[PDB]
């Protein structure tokens with residue numbers, strides 16, 4: 001009855017203007033995930049350079065307040081655990097490490113130390129592909145998904161697994177999963193475009209629905225309102241589509257491609273890599289960024305008001321399913337100098353937000369850049 | 375505030391080029407640019423992961 | 436907000452158990468065995484789809500019977516083995532030790548003068564932490580064997596698990612009792628999945644189950660759980 | 676005052692209960708989907724179908740719930756009855772035991788359902804006349820003795836199936 | 852008989868994807884060497900400028 | 901008829917024994933192919949990023 005979607009939702013009528021606050025490059029290569037501590041006091045970004053870096057949300061008026069590197073391999077997913085006390089990270093090394101964060105006052109330097117660890121045999125589980133943490137009081141389970149389809153709920157209260165699910169690999173590689181804010185159900189998105197719903201109460205596979213284009217589920221999120229809807233980001237055409245798992249109908253879609261809406265023909269190579277969704281004032285906001293490196297603010301209540309956040313007006317402006325279609329407009333005097341391109345210049349891999357006294361967007365790309373916006 | 379901006383700005387540009395961390399100081403406005411514009415900084419023009427390290431942030435803050 | 440309970444030694448009344456129904460197909464022997472011994476033809480397995488089975492209910496403990504075996508009164512069956520009989524067991528709650536067991540054997544006729552067991556199921560009267568069995572239970576009936584009350588029981592009616600339906604049934608009952616969070620859109624799907632699983636188990640296996648029920652003792656609109664306890668178990672030893 | 680959906684005025688949650696094999700799923704399927712089938716899948720837990728109907732010019736949305744009738748999926752306390760607007764007790768007119776257990780299903784209503792919930796005794800499988808055991812008079816005497824409406828029916832042949840659910844919807848509207 | 856063909860075709864798919872994986876890693880290796888040349892051309896042009 | 905039943909029962913058993921072996925093999929093809937797919941889905945992003 002009372003599961004809040006966000007510990008701190010966006011301010012009322014929040015509209016990210018696209019002002020860059022911090023340009024960060026402390027990572028040697030591609031950043032894989034951006035996660036914000038549920039306190040919004042810190043956030044963390046992991047990278048293919050094998051390091052993870054933790055950042056102070058309040059210092060985004062900049063420096064990696066903490067850093068860790070002693071796992072090796074590409075660290076490609078992390079999550080906080082409903083507080084800045086714990087932060088878990090995982091690498092293609094198959095190591096799952098529970099880092100404890102030490103919060104200190106200004107005079108004494110902070111530190112990170114590993115306080116829990118697991119290793120996955122590459123022949124029997126493979127590395128993780130995604131993970132999520134969700135408290136239930138009696139347990140502090142860290143669910144994570146592995147290449148062999150195992151989805152394991154590691155209870156951070158001990159070494160015991162709360163539960164384990166065996167995704168049918170005939171549906172392809174697990175590319176992302178999400179869990180209900182109510183913790184009643186779960187949905188697995190795959191490289192072949194299949195969403196497979198699991199009822200976490202019974203731990204049974206209740207349903208399987210497949211994208212008609214049979215294309216990779218790049219991100220998966222529960223819907224902030226409709227308890228049976230899953231926001232599945234799909235490869236090609238920047239397609240973000242809400243799927244009602246109670247019936248399998250694709251019943252809302254965001255589209256931004258040269259290909260006409262929902263067409264299976266030659267899809268654009270661009271794809272959405274990060275989706276942030278919030279109910280706000282009951283007017284749900286969905287913010288997407290990806291391989292076209294253009295952050296799009298989508299207003300699901302008034303889609304005509306949707307706009308590109310990652311760029312000024314120097315850039316070219318823009319089946320019974322409610323599809324929002326983006327069509328580029330069919331559009332010298334040196335009226336002041338040309339400014340530097342503020343946006344990313346490489347594939348954006350994730351989007352996150354924090355609300356420390358203002359609504360900031362964090363974005364990161366495959367070159368290791370991390371950018372803060374407001 | 376303009377001096378704070380300009381000096382912090384220069385230092386940020388200095389760090390972006392991986393200039394010698396021990397030489398740069400937050401007050402020596404023109405000397406900082408001199409180390410950046412002269413051939414002494416072999417890395418000038420390179421684009422890569424600068425870090426604005428703690429030993430240089432603590433001097434500013 | 437409150438848990439109400441009583442000690443097994445304070446409740447000086449006879450234990451009572453409802454023999455419910457028996458669910459599941461009964462394995463018919465191939466006629467090859469009927470040729471080996473022709474008296475099989477007259478057993479209740481072959482003469483009628485539902486035979487007039489009966490259930491014995493001996494309370495065992497430490498591998499010894501605590502008392503004489505109570506048995507279900509005769510009830511005619513046509514299409515469903517269903518007894519709705521509260522057997523007043525011959526032992527009282529203070530007479531029961533922590534490892535007390537009911538050994539529910541199901542019997543059928545085998546010609547004149549000779550009963551034969553359809554199956555048997557043994558369930559401990561006290562749960563994981565000494566509370567007496569609180570309600571309806573579906574016990575796995577081990578076929579063709581008489582229920583054994585030795586400890587450990589070779590024919591346990593319950594599992595700690597280890598198969599789908601033993602877990603999904605517990606969750607189903609918990610969901611019915613309202614213990615599990617209701618979600619109409621999920622339930623309408625997950626229970627279809629459990630239906631498929633159960634119907635598969637009903638085909639790939641021929642196990643049967645015996646429903647039983649224990650009386651929920653009440654007082655002033657409160658229901659008291661019975662906890663295995665001992666008079667003098669209340670005092671820690673005064674060792675100096 | 677309260678919010679009101681433009682499609683339906685009243686949401687009447689109906690619930691079907693009764694012993695296993697009495698035909699609750701068949702009745703639910705015949706009413707909400709006009710389909711019938713010999714294949715028996717023993718229901719577990721809950722199932723429901725929505726059917727929209729019209730009575731006295733009012734659009735009535737019926738959410739009909741089908742509970743598991745088997746011993747193994749039943750429990751002493753039940754929370755399916757909670758919030759039911761009307762409850763149908765089904766029995767198989769070809770099995771006296773299912774009819775006898777109606778007495779026991781009724782006391783579950785008086786214990787867990789709404790204090791004045793609508794009740795309706797339904798006698799499915801009336802098409803098996805050569806196998807019927809209860810008399811219509813035996814059932815009517817019992818139903819009237821408790822004031823609950825009653826309709827013998829057949830999911831197989833749709834016989835009185837529609838009328839059985841429509842009658843309870845009307846009875847609930849009459850109650851509110 | 853349907854499984855024998857599947858085992859064959861899945862094995863051919865495993866071989867094909869493994870060969871494709873090899874060419875992508877080699878292509879990225881080569882493209883990185885060119886990107887290195889681009890970044891050095893840019894570094895030299897920038898420094899001269 | 902018992903002889904024929906026994907012979908056919910062994911045939912069904914031994915043919916199904918191959919079916920379950922192929923099930924383990926196909927399960928292994930998926931388990932391995934999923935790994936090659938994971939790698940491929942990164943090389944494609946590295947290629948596009950480079």
Ligand SMILES: Nc1nc2c(ncn2[C@@H]2O[C@H](COP(=O)(O)OP(=O)(O)OP(=O)(O)O)[C@@H](O)[C@H]2O)c(=O)[nH]1
Pocket residue numbers: 693694695696697698699700701702712713714715716717718719742743744745799800801802803828829830831832
């Ligand atoms: N002749 C006849 N047979 C029926 C009728 N309705 C149901 N049946 C038979 O009874 C079987 C079981 O019907 P169900 O509706 O599944 O019984 P149920 O009440 O749902 O039983 P549970 O799901 O276990 O609670 C069906 O498969 C049919 O074979 C009917 O109206 N006439």
